[PDB]
Amino acid sequence: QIRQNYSTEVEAAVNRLVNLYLRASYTYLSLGFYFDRDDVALCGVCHFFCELAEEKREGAERLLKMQNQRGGRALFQDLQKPSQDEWGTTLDAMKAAIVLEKSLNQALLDLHALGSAQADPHLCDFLESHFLDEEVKLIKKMGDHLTNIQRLVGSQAGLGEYLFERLTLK
Amino acid sequence: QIRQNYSTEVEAAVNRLVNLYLRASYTYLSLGFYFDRDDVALCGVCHFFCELAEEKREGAERLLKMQNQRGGRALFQDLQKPSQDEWGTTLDAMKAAIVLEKSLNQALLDLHALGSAQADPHLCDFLESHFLDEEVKLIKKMGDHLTNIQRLVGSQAGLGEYLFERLTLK
Amino acid sequence: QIRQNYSTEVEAAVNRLVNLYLRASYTYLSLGFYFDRDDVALCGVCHFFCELAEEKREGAERLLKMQNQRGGRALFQDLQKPSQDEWGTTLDAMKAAIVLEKSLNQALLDLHALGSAQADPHLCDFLESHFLDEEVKLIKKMGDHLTNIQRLVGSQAGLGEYLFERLTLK
Amino acid sequence: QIRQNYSTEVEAAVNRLVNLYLRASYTYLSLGFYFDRDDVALCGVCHFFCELAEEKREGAERLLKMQNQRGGRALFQDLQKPSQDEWGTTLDAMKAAIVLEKSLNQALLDLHALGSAQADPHLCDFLESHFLDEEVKLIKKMGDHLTNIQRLVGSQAGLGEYLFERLTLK
Amino acid sequence: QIRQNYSTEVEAAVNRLVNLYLRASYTYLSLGFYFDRDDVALCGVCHFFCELAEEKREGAERLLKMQNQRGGRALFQDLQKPSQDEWGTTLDAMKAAIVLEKSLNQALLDLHALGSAQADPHLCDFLESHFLDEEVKLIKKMGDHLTNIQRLVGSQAGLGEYLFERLTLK
Ligand SMILES: [Au+]
Ligand SMILES: [Au+]
Ligand SMILES: [Au+]
Ligand SMILES: [Au+]
Ligand SMILES: [Au+]
Ligand SMILES: [Au+]
Ligand SMILES: [Au+]
Ligand SMILES: [Au+]
Ligand SMILES: [Au+]
Ligand SMILES: [Au+]
Ligand SMILES: [Au+]
Ligand SMILES: [Au+]
Ligand SMILES: [Au+]
Ligand SMILES: [Au+]
Ligand SMILES: [Au+]
Ligand SMILES: [Au+]
Ligand SMILES: [Au+]
Ligand SMILES: [Au+]
Ligand SMILES: [Au+]
Ligand SMILES: [Au+]
Ligand SMILES: [Au+]
Ligand SMILES: [Au+]
Ligand SMILES: [Au+]
Ligand SMILES: [Au+]
Ligand SMILES: [Au+]
Ligand SMILES: [Au+]
Ligand SMILES: [Au+]
Ligand SMILES: [Au+]
Ligand SMILES: [Au+]
Ligand SMILES: [Au+]
Ligand SMILES: [Au+]
Ligand SMILES: [Au+]
Ligand SMILES: [Au+]
Ligand SMILES: [Au+]
Ligand SMILES: [Au+]
Ligand SMILES: [Au+]
Ligand SMILES: [Au+]
Ligand SMILES: [Au+]
Ligand SMILES: [Au+]
Ligand SMILES: [Au+]
């Protein structure tokens, strides 16, 4: 047995977080393909969400690797379908993405609180190194996007949405 | 004689398809030069249609090479003049181009049905390799274009049409 | 509209196949992490299943890209959890993997039958190019594995299982 | 004086941990040379333990450097002789090594608890960066080894022990 | 003593100018970080003001080096906080920046008048070489910016402000 100072509570929460990251990966996959539709056709938005799907999957994989390193047991649940089938405008889509990220971020913070209450400094080290700072960085980028997109709507939302995709998401 | 398993029906239809591809090449030549007019002056649109003229010509040449490989006889008809002399807006032009492509694509599908009814798997192999997938890809690109162009019209179509040429057709 | 010669039946079946490939990806993710457990510890098996997870995901993505190219609409369902939580021996795991692959392969064949009944030669071209041959190749590799693993059990299954991982899965 | 926010309790515990790491280095030195005996002759095991002796020494040196950076005073005690003179089988030896590592790891965790009770975030930063994650990684590797070694014993332990040294420890 | 032909009046004025350049550096630091806010999010504006903060600091350092070369004594005062906490639009910000620069430029001219009234040609050489021409160049660039920004407001200031940041400040 390698397991040491690793509570069943953290073990479970790590499995839930894996599910959350995979689910987020799935939502980004759906977002990306929506923006590749011929009647939506915003290549740069598709690319942004494609790349985020990959980052969320990698996040899940790192959590799983850590679960195994600590002697926990990975348990997988169903991955729920994304919350929408069609995602509206780039604005709507980025708002949905920032909500998703804040929910992941909250999950990360809830796991840190569980970790320090269980006195598990390896878990706290792991989250800090690979998750907390990356999530903060991403949420700041999405907020920046949302601000630019919002500035671009009003009289001519079609024009704004094109320009954003062409000149920011490039 | 090399001819084997090659019906006179397919032979004829291959000649008609050559005519269609050459005609499409001609239409794209007209489209390209219209957008090079000093009073139209959309370089990127001209370039898009120039390149499509070349692809349609190459398509015809591949069909002809295949006609000869199978022991058929190439027969050439008049190439009808393009359906318009002036092509309106970039939007009008891309709509005309997508109609043209759907008609070529239908011709390709009608030739596949003729081919499997005649049990001619070499013909079916040929269309799949060089035509069906390329045409699908092209029609998806035109649909994407049309969606972006449409999004760019409304209050200021002049501005939209410039931006599309400068930032998508680059 | 780009949609041409693309039935709602094929559209639906393509969405189901995407689900199947993603589900298979998920199962391989579970398989890979099981073999990374400290009490299982077969690095080469983990690596084999990790790489298969990636190939199944790519398969799904190619199907989705094709759905969009044809003017269909991607619809995502829940991804069911893998069929086991623990996967037994390398033998048990490879048997489960070959069952999974035969089920994907059958789905591919059922989609080909639907495609020729609907006279959709672009779909048939797509499956042949990217799916049918790859799946056949993979199933042959798994059968080869299963044969070697089986040959290695009997008196000393522990020893056999180590050697296979070290000298075949390397 | 540079000393700031550095308790005498942490200072002492850091000195004890240095002793523990040096002692572990010494035990690995003994382990390595045992496996170099002509009547034991397992080169790859010797190499594994040689390299671990070096890592434990480096760990001690990093702790000492940190003791000085914080204005503590390094105090050295006797280094106790390793717990055995002969180490049995590769299995016995790896079990002893994992026990040693769990004891170091516990010492690291006890030092983290002392550090957060003393509100010494520099100490906590130091342990996380250079010790906690490395120790977790090492214990997972040893557990993996132990699992493979165990799988290889039974009918023919001699054969298993050779193969492990030749094909894993390479 | 190295001091030669260097009045106490110039010495004092050089110290005041150092203060002015540092203060300007500080204002540009504030400007840059305002435009990095998630609710402002104009990367190119931030970059423009960041680079100006650096140039003003370098200007101060060159003045200080010259103070020492002439045998004067550097005396530092408080650096007053920038004149605003929030800087409005890119237009407002560039207007504030041009006002700041005209005030620095006037200070440079007042120091030249003091220098020729004191018959201090080394001081006059120094200002000409490193300050007067650079400041003129910068003020011309800001005026050019202001003209482009102004041209871009009216019906759609959001759109104009985005485009300027994306296509001029790049
Ligand atoms: Au995408
Ligand atoms: Au994309
Ligand atoms: Au994608
Ligand atoms: Au924590
Ligand atoms: Au913690
Ligand atoms: Au974003
Ligand atoms: Au975004
Ligand atoms: Au971005
Ligand atoms: Au042209
Ligand atoms: Au052209
Ligand atoms: Au041309
Ligand atoms: Au056919
Ligand atoms: Au056929
Ligand atoms: Au097009
Ligand atoms: Au187009
Ligand atoms: Au294009
Ligand atoms: Au794996
Ligand atoms: Au692996
Ligand atoms: Au993996
Ligand atoms: Au088929
Ligand atoms: Au078919
Ligand atoms: Au296999
Ligand atoms: Au296998
Ligand atoms: Au293999
Ligand atoms: Au050794
Ligand atoms: Au050795
Ligand atoms: Au050694
Ligand atoms: Au700590
Ligand atoms: Au602490
Ligand atoms: Au080990
Ligand atoms: Au070992
Ligand atoms: Au090893
Ligand atoms: Au900045
Ligand atoms: Au910046
Ligand atoms: Au900055
Ligand atoms: Au002067
Ligand atoms: Au002068
Ligand atoms: Au400026
Ligand atoms: Au400016
Ligand atoms: Au500029």
Numbering used by the authors:
A (entry chain X), B (entry chain X), C (entry chain X), D (entry chain X), E (entry chain X): 3 to 172
What does the paper say about this structure?
Using this concept, we replaced the Glu45 and Arg52 residues of recombinant L-chain apo-Fr from horse liver (apo-rHLFr) by Cys and the resulting apo-rHLFr mutant apo-E45C/R52C-rHLFr was used in the current study. Herein we describe a crystal structure analysis of Au(III) ions accumulated in the ferritin cage and subsequent reduction of the metal ions by sodium borohydride inside the crosslinked single crystal.
The structure of the crosslinked crystal (Au·CL-apo-E45C/R52C-rHLFr) was refined to 1.95 Å resolution. All of the Au binding sites in the ferritin cage are divided into three deposition regions; the three-fold axis channel (Site-A), the metal accumulation site (Site-B) and at Met96 (Site-C). At Site-A, there are two Au atoms, one of which (Au1) is coordinated by Cys126 and a water molecule. The other Au ion (Au2) at Site-A is coordinated by both His114 and Cys126. At Site-B, three different Au ions (Au3–Au5) are present, which form a thiol-bridged (Cys48 and Cys52) trinuclear structure.
